[PDB]
Subunit: 101 residues, 2 copies
């Protein structure tokens, strides 16, 4: 039941490993549908240059379709799912939730 | 009217001025709707690495939709028109 905002509960190392399997177009389309907070969490884990290429693309693109944004997000979630099986995804320090049955 | 195959008639310098303005994704989708001689013309105008960066995209992408390929070719034609009314072409 993982959704795109759950990326906020993964450690910096996981996000960096996930950023290597996505291309520039998919990472940018997904960001147009992210919280200001997930955005900074994402920019913080990219090199100085990789981030500048990203801002280039974001300015270059313009108006995009909602469904294209949702598709880019699912493609990024499937990568995470794949890297999890190879044991490379780790939940952050305070990234756990208290539940009630 | 200017269609995508008419790019086979711009010279090397003009093509280098166009490749500068287009992003990786638009070029990959666009070339997926090109003849073999238009692909060769564009490839001899981009660096050994740029063509490597393009192979990656092309392979990372997989199957694509005809509407997106058409949308990518139109973006490039729009860039070409901007460059023409300027005088840079």
């Amino acid at each position: 039941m993982f959704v795109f905002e759950d990326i906020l509960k993964l450690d910096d190392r996981s996000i960096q490993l996930v950023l290597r399997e996505v291309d520039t177009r998919d990472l940018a389309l997904a960001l147009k549908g992210a919280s200001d907070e997930l955005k900074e969490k994402i920019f913080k884990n990219m090199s100085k240059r990789a981030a500048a290429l990203l801002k280039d693309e974001l300015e270059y693109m313009g108006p995009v379709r909602l469904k294209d944004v949702e598709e880019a997000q699912q493609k990024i979630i499937n990568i995470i799912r794949r890297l999890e099986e190879a044991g490379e995804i780790v939940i952050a320090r305070g990234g756990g939730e208290e539940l009630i049955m």
